[model samples]
Target: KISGGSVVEMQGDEMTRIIWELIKEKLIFPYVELDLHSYDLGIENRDATNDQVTKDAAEAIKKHNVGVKCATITPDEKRVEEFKLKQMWKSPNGTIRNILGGTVFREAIICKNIPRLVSGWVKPIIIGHHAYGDQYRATDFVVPGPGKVEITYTPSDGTQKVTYLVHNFEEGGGVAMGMYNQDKSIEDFAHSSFQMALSKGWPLYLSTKNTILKKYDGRFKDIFQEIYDKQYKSQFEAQKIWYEHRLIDDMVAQAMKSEGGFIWACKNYDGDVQSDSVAQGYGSLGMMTSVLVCPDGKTVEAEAAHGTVTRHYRMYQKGQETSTNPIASIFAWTRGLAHRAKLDNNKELAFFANALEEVSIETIEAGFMTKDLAACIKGLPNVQRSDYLNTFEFMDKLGENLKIKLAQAKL
Candidate 1:
């Protein structure tokens, strides 16, 4: 019997949560025995533990070096009311990233039958974001009236204090904010980006608004360049890959025109916004896979780029047949397992992971998919119930296909 090894498994809310178990039942447990350190990050459980479950889960992933997660709810006021929580908790993903100290890379899964909005994107365009610091951790103040806004840096070395008058606030007293990134964090981000590009054998491009925010964004550009020259440039050259910096606007324009076989590293805010655009352009959020890679290039956590599918979960709760796409969620497992295989030097496990992904793409190409994917092929106006498989039916079909594939591999 083959063992799938162990990983930190974080479960979540809504439709993806339901799909998560079915995937394990149909695909994973049947073939391989797995030692799963499971944590329930469901809204109710999170509330029960005051979100300590999330913190523990992050620690477990760090300890185990691999995590497979399902999309969870980040409570807004409405969710807070719905769940009736003590406080609206932060995003679980953000908390995990903070503990892990890594970069997140998202890739689109391509199928021949699906029509991408960007006609030229036959290959995948991998987009990665430096997930630490910047706007996500910034401090802001709403200026009340006419006042001066200044920034002061007090050196810890007992050196002279440097103060800069950020704004005089003479006009009407505008709002002010401050953000920062550590040298160590930027170095980690650079290493992770370079490692990812080298792993994919694709060129890497770092996009920044350095032209406008010279001091802030320039740090990112300069650090990446410095790191490349010292550590990665020769390796990139040997791999026939290259690293370059581009102005954010120009990078976007270039990406729009390209055929899509490169990695684009963005600052925190740009990545948060642009990833959605890239996901939509490829076809659907359901077709995107997200992986967080640590600087050391050994630890990884994989999950779907999409959300909990709250609307579909409602339909499912009502006993209505819902055709939620599970491709991305399935890839979360495969990608995470692929990493595990690499770490463990388990070729059979790696083959099993690859086989599962191949069956998914092949199944989609064979004209069988869930409603979201079917909608991608036939526009919303023209789509019919008969055009796609129900959620359970689709997973069943994947199970059937995977069994055949594994059996054929035996011969």
Candidate 2:
């Protein structure tokens, strides 16, 4: 077995949770001896623990320096009653990122057989999302009647209290909002992206609507450029990879036409919306991987970009064989383990990850895939029993192929 150091393992809910167990058992346990400080961040347990388990999991990831998380549920009104008693819990990803001061970077898994929406997008594009502020944390209100909406800002040592009359409403009122992003948080996200571009050997483009929202969006562009020039410009030049700033709307059209093999840095709202476009353009969300890179650049948390697959989980509960895709879940492990190998300077461990990733991509390309991937080739209605393997069988297929590669590598 390859020597792997400790990793924070967060178990989540539904179908992805089932895939998580299978991955550890079939793919990881047999090949590597790892210290998995597993935390049950399941929804039911989160309710039982009053969501302490999720926060504790984040802290453990901070201590361990790496985490591979499964998809988790942030309870809504239906889930609150479904799980029975407990207020709505916050998103586990949001809580974890808040604790770590991180930014999310998502990239699509490339498979030869799966046809992408953009025929020219032969290579994968990486989206590094600044997940901290803007719309997600904004305070907004519906104007009750004809009145002025103003915003105020006061800092310590009070040079002055500044106020802005954002809007003066008429009798037919409208909504007003105040959105923000802090300098420290912006700087942290910049450093993380700069480090990622250096490590990825790919050029980066940070997009913003600075022309319209000069102070707000321009801050992000300015910070990113400052960090790049100060810290990473030379490093990026050495690798022949570069960094540039593009306007958000202009960037979208450029991305559509260009053959993608670059990294894109986006603000909270842009990243949330744009990242999904890249995921779909590449293929299925089932083949997307999300990694949260900490400001330190070494510590990170990896997970599938998709949700828990409630539909498939429902079928599994009814004793029916499911064909849910597990590639994204599997890549979460590989990426997490690869990051561990980088931190530990373990060549064999790194090679294991490389081989595993290759085996996975090769298997699907060889026509052994789950229903989600199979549907990419044949229409969902036209897919048959022979089109793809069942969910359980897919797990075994990965294990089988992974075993062959390890032997070939003389591991």
Candidate 3:
């Protein structure tokens, strides 16, 4: 039995969710057996449960230590109105990340035929995003009409509190924001990033604007440095890989010029910006994979970097042909399975995951791809009907190719 162990399977919304089912039915079910724990994180279910389902799903993953998730809707005001939600709940991904408390490492799934905007990128540049605290959880509002703002921190026992007089606004209106990160959190971020770098066998560079933020951003630098020098330094050295801290500007320039075979650890806000930038530079957001690694590098949650594909799902709703890409979503499973196999010492399971991933890339490389990729090769106007497959056909083709690949693997 290829049932390596238990895994939490999260269902989601829209076109990617539609593709998620096909993946299980076609690519996954035929090959391996898993103790599947299913959770519905769909918009309706989330609203019905007041988003408790997402929380429960996260807790389940914590228990099982593995989760493969489909792309879910993080409702905005417009989405709230459209879906008639109870309230504008936070992003499900956000909530899960908060519960998980780890760094999200997003890497592009590169194919030979799909050209990168940055011509020099041959291998993947994995961006490890520090998602814990900072701007995402910061309190911000407009600085209205010449007000004094002071940042204060008080101890639990009310001993020796420190208050910094940030600035006294001279004129009418700007903005004021206060952000923080705990030592434990930053330490975990360092540990996760170091583990990822070691696993990938690639050097790591942590980028932060320490010169400006001083204490704020400096803590990130200090924590990573302290942890690395004390714990990870020898391991990193033994692996023949190294970790260094770089300024944000220099790091960006270095990334653009480098041949893209390293892990970049970015602070929360920097990660929010750079991960998208690097994803676009590679090729399609449809081809990007995201995996969250815990501090100890045990628990992981894998998902596609892209969204619910609302536009494509709407087209499909009308019974129109839609060619939504499912490559990243497929990778989500392969990655999660690979991790499971590694944890379980299941060679059979590992082989199946790696083979499925290779077949996916090979299929796309051989010119069987969705419209998004077809347009990337030949402009939208130049793309012919023969050049691409609709959503179902693409998954079916992968199913066929996966069969052949697995069959040949026996020999």
Candidate 4:
């Protein structure tokens, strides 16, 4: 059995919660005696604890340096009513991200049999977002009537105030928004992106709208360049990879055409939109794995890019079989355990994690997959029950394959 270090396990909501248990029981616990620091971030628990559980979970992840989280529900007004919550809790991922302070990188799990809309993408295109600022934290105002919208900066040294008219609402009332980003956050984002690219030995591209928002987007461009030159350029050169800045439009076009094998760093908004587009183009979001890397490159939290499978959960509740794909959720365990193995120098544990991941992909490639992936290979209209396994059946297949793989590894 693989054993060494502990990982913070943040349990989540819906179908992923059920899948999470099966994943541990079948793939993890049987082979490894893991010391798991568990935290329940389920909607009911979050409501009962006033969401303090989320913060505590983030701290545990920080303390342990590795977290494997199940997909959670970020309650909205509708969800609030459904869960009968005390209050609408913020996104657990967002809260954890705020506490951890890092960049979230999403990588697609590629399989030979799964058909990608971008057919040339043989490898994974990893996209990372500088999650700390820009549109996500912006303040907006709806102008009541014609008025001047001004941006002002007042120096702390009792110097003259600088002000610029952002928009002249002389013609009619409009909207104005103000957004900000810190140098420290951007620097951290740069370090994390460079570290990720270096780890993968893939070229890194930082896309920005510098031509339009010169000072704002240009700041991102300049900071990344400075950090690369002083810190990562030599390492990148040694690794035979490079970092370059591209216009957002140009980068999107290039990304669409190129075979996937690079790290693309995006602003908050761009990353939010592009990640979904990339995830769909590659295949299913169920095949996408997301990991948050701190600036130190030491701490990370891994999870599936997809959300809690509510629809499938409802069907399962009615005693119906659901062919939900669990690849991403399974990888959440593999990625987190792999990081734990690295930190603790557990070669055997690392081998087990790699083997499990390989078995998962190989199982799908060998024609044993869930409905989502089967639909990708044989169009939804053509997909048959014989073409895919039910959710539990798929996990059983992975477990069988994993056992065989581990046995072969012994030889």
Model 2 residue 44 CA deviation in Å: 1.4
Across residues 1-411, which tens digit of lDDT does each residue of candidate 1 receive?
A: 578788889999999899898998998899887889999988889999998999999999987788999999989999888878899999999999988899989888999899877788787888888784376767998998788988999999999999999888777866899877788889999999998998879999999889889988999999999999998899989999899999989899998898889998988564563346556665578888899998998899999988998899999999999888888899999988988998898998999999999999999999999888888888878888899999999999999999999999989
Worst 10 residues of 1 by lDDT: 269-278
lDDT, model 4: 0.88
Residue 112 alpha-carbon offset, candidate 2, angstroms: 1.3
RMSD of each: 1.6, 1.6, 1.8, 1.4
Clashes of 1: 0
Candidate 2: pairs in clash: none
Residue ranges of candidate 1 with Cα displaced over 4 Å: 268-270, 273-275, 281-283
Q: Which model scores highest in TM-score? A: 4
**Candidate 1 backbone collisions, by pair:** none
Which residue segments of model 3 deviate by more than 4 Å? 268-270, 273-275, 281-283
- lDDT (0 to 1) per candidate: 0.88, 0.85, 0.87, 0.88
Writing each residue's lDDT as its tens digit, candidate 4 over 152-205 gives 999999999999989888777978898888898899999999989987779999
Comparing 2 with 4 on lDDT, the higher-scoring candidate is 4
- Of the two candidates 3 and 4, the one with more favorable TM-score, higher being better, is 4
List model 3 lDDT by residue over 1-411, tens digit each: 477689998899998888899999999988888899999999899899998999999999998898999999888889888988899988888888889888888888888899887778898788877783366768898887788988988999979998989889987768888776678888888999998898878999999989898877888998999999998899988988899999988999988887888998888564553345556654467888898899988888899988888899999899999998998899999989999988898899999989998999999999899999998898889989899998989989999999999889899
Listed in order, each prediction's TM-score against the native is 0.96, 0.96, 0.95, 0.97
